[PDB]
Amino acid sequence: MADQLTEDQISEFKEAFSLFDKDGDGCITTKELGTVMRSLGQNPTEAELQDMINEVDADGNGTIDFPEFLNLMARKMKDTDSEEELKEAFRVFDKDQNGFISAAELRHVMTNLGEKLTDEEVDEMIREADVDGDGQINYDEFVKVMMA
Ligand SMILES: [Ca+2]
Ligand SMILES: [Ca+2]
Ligand SMILES: [Ca+2]
Ligand SMILES: [Ca+2]
């Protein structure tokens, strides 16, 4: 996500927040959160609802206002994006979509990415990330090497 949000993104988040804010006073209370939680098939304890609210209540006034709500969703958005970007990238490399990146696929995709590696380089790159040593890179392995 990054930082600055677009007007449409903000306006949407406001519509959402509007659902949580059952009595529309501009702030979400534990009670209002519980109502929303339950309706989704959950049953948080009064202690959990207070934690959830408290963990998002930056100014400590007891409730969640729009900017507090927005900052939470923005962090969740960026987390999702980062993860989704890792998944997209893996898909690009996994040319045959079998769940693994092979040396041949790494060489191919790489070249087509403006990166031409030699045979030695290709194999070393695979080995460097190949934790279980089966000769190919699975998703967990790709993630591990990407976030490092
Ligand atoms: Ca309210
Ligand atoms: Ca607050
Ligand atoms: Ca593959
Ligand atoms: Ca492997």
Q: How far is the CA of 125 from the centre of ligand 4 (A)?
A: 12
Q: How far is the CA of 67 from the centre of ligand 1 (A)?
A: 14
The torsion defined by the Cα of 16, 20, 26 and 29, in degrees rounded to 10, comes to: -150
Question: Which structural technique was applied?
Answer: X-ray
Written in H, E and C, the secondary structure of the chain is: CCCCCCHHHHHHHHHHHHHHCCCCCCCECHHHHHHHHHHCCCCCCHHHHHHHHHHHCCCCCCCECHHHHHHHHHHHHHHHHHHHHHHHHHHHHCCCCCCEECHHHHHHHHHCCCCCCCHHHHHHHHHHHCCCCCCCEEHHHHHHHHCC
Provide the CATH topology of domain 1-78: Recoverin; domain 1 (1.10.238)
79-148 classified as CATH 3.40.50.10190: no
Domain ranges in the chain are 1-78, 79-148
Q: How far is the CA of 116 from the centre of ligand 4 (A)?
A: 23
Q: Give the separation between CA 64 and CA 43, rounded to whole angstroms.
A: 20
Resolution rounded to one decimal, in angstroms: 2.0
Q: 1-78 and 79-148 share one CATH topology? A: yes
Q: How far is the CA of 1 from the centre of ligand 1 (A)?
A: 28
Which ligand has an atom closest to residue 134 CA?
Answer: 4
